[PDB]
């Protein structure tokens, strides 16, 4: 290369540039902007460059994810083939509808009356606007479809409505394909929010050690406990583990990104939870106070505002276990496989591969105690010490067998078994109670006893 200046200075305006370890989320959207089934993006501006329309479900998810306090710097997007799209006006609106729309980059304009008139008006402007896109109103909504293999993307803005994409590919069948291209993603979110589609993803994630998150606008979420007509009830019965929370914008803003934005960079080793964490973009729950009680029994978390701010209350999963415990279990699993695996490769590549004998097996205590266990203790996620009531110690234990104790069959297969480990989890604080008292005037003189208080009554036999 040739450099014309000995020193070169780039000067920009607005802010200085923001790299850490994080877990990427994956959002399974419906689009046709690339032939691949998974692609990584680092910013919203990258999405629109690929033909994504502003306000589209994929764009709304990404913008919320990057706005969190623990936001990741790289998101992943799935792909399902679009069959059509809808713009639904089953709701009153009294302002111009700036419906962004992109082919292969315009912004349709509408003016407002009744939903039927405005829906018809929009279809009129789509036609005679570009005779290669389909638009037809039907009662109270407009269906938009591409006539040819041409990318079409419908956005959002300045109006009161929702976009509902449709596809023929079921979630249960798409997921095995996307995981084939790449598996470097931890959180799983899905655009298709049908009752059956959500359950299918939950079963898949459980068997693949992924974490499933979903929002829902269902009114049955906080309905009376007897009415088991909500998706939350179905998951609870199946004993699945998924983090769901009721929110009114779940289908207009796709607030899953805000929830993920507060977990991506939060390493489980600290034992921190989602209690009282701030979600930047969700709206406080409004349903009275009894409605809050119904949701809690449903394991349907809510975003609740107190003292001027917003606070996420309890991250109970569908089965009832707290989320921070579930993330810890996955953290323990992943960081013990890598630690042991990484040690065997350092020995296999030196020619001195590890061998099954009593002079080599004991070394694992130094490996396991080093990477996974010691980090937890330093960060406070693992308890240690002594218990004064049960009279037991919390120190982690590691037991390794002996060559004489291994069946002859296992030596032929060259596989070790029955390594056992114990740990104690450290629980955060969620609720507190206080018993204050007030004295009005001159409380009576106290007892003058000045002896050490005897701790037990003499008569016990």
């Amino acid at each position: 290369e040739y450099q014309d200046k000995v020193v070169d200075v780039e000067v920009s305006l607005g802010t200085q540039p923001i790299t850490v370890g994080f877990e990427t989320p994956m959002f399974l959207a419906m689009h046709g902007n690339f032939p691949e089934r998974i692609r990584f993006y680092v910013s919203t501006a990258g999405m629109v460059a690929d033909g994504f329309a502003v306000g589209s479900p994929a764009y709304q998810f990404a913008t919320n994810a990057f706005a969190g306090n623990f936001a990741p710097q790289r998101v992943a997007i799935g792909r399902m083939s679009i069959d059509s799209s809808k713009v639904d006006f089953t709701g009153t609106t009294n302002t111009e509808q700036v419906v962004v729309n992109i082919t292969l980059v315009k912004a349709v304009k509408i003016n407002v009356n009744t939903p039927a008139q405005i829906a018809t008006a929009l279809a009129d402007a789509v036609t005679a606007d570009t005779g290669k896109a389909t638009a037809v109103a039907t009662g109270t909504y407009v269906t938009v479809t591409a006539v040819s293999p041409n990318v079409v993307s419908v956005g959002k803005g300045a109006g009161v409505y929702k976009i509902v994409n449709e596809s023929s590919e079921t979630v249960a069948t798409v997921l095995p394909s996307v995981i084939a291209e790449n598996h470097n993603w931890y959180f799983l979110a899905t655009e298709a929010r049908s009752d059956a589609d959500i359950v299918a993803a939950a079963e898949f994630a459980k068997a693949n050690y992924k974490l499933h998150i979903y929002n829902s606008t269902d009114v049955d979420a906080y309905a009376p406990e007897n009415s088991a007509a909500s998706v939350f009830d179905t998951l609870k019965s199946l004993s699945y583990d998924s983090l769901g929370t009721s929110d009114a914008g779940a289908d207009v803003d796709f607030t899953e990104g805000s929830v993920i934005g507060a977990m991506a960079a939060n390493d489980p080793s600290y034992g921190d939870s989602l209690h009282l964490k701030t979600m930047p973009g969700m709206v406080p729950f409004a349903g009275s106070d009894t409605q809050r009680s119904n949701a809690w029994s449903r394991n349907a978390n809510i975003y609740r505002g107190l003292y001027g701010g917003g606070s996420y209350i309890e991250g109970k999963t569908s089965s009832g276990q707290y989320v921070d415990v579930i993330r810890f279990s996955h953290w323990v699993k992943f960081r013990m496989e890598e630690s042991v695996f990484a040690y065997m490769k350092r020995r296999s590549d030196m020619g001195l591969s590890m061998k099954m004998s009593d002079e080599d097996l004991p070394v694992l205590k130094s490996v396991l105690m080093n990477n996974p266990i010691n980090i937890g203790i330093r960060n406070g996620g693992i308890l240690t010490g002594y218990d004064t009531e049960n009279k037991v110690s919390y120190d982690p234990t590691i037991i390794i067998p002996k060559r004489a104790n291994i069946p002859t069959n296992d030596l032929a297969a060259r596989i070790l078994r029955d390594v056992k480990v114990e740990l104690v989890y450290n629980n955060s604080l969620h609720y507190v109670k206080i018993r204050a008292s007030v004295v009005l005037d001159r409380p009576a003189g106290q007892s003058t006893n000045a002896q050490t208080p005897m701790s037990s009554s003499a008569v016990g036999v």
Binding site: I377, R378, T384, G385
Partner: protein, 154 residues
């Protein structure tokens, strides 16, 4: 409770670089190497008879940095020549920057304040040049973390 190591990297005295005027200083003596002290207290307190107390913030940050060097280092001659030149011409201010290994740092403008005594004996002696600094605020630039906003229930 188990004892915890503070920093994953040992404190290496050779990583504490001293820059005066843009040149690295070499030839330090034994025991201590750099001593940085302020001149006055940061906050003064006016105690009252009844009990009311009020505080004031000091606006003076003058400090003295002590450099210890062996008699056989060329930097002694460098400092003597600089002293003579500053005396004859008049310009006496030069930049001073100190980079810590695992501690605080310092970056201000300094000057030569006092020359040290020169002793000659059986062993090689030590001379402590006294350098004054405009501001003596130590900076935690090397350490990563922003908890000052988090801390504070005032």
């Amino acid at each position: 409770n188990q004892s915890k190591i503070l920093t994953l990297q040992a404190y290496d005295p050779a990583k504490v670089l001293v820059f005066i005027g843009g040149q690295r200083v070499s030839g330090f003596a034994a025991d201590t190497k750099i001593v940085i002290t302020r001149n006055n207290d940061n906050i003064s307190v006016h105690a009252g008879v009844d009990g009311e107390i009020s505080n004031a913030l000091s606006r003076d940050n003058t400090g003295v940095m002590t450099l210890s060097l062996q008699n056989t280092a060329k930097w002694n001659g460098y400092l003597a020549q600089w002293q003579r030149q500053a005396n004859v011409t008049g310009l006496i201010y030069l930049p001073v920057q100190v980079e810590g290994s695992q501690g605080l740092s310092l970056n201000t403008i300094g000057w030569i304040q006092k020359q040290p005594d020169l002793s000659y004996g059986t062993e090689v002696g030590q001379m402590d040049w006294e350098i004054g600094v405009l501001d003596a605020w130590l900076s935690p630039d090397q350490i990563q973390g922003i908890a000052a906003g988090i801390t504070g229930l005032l």
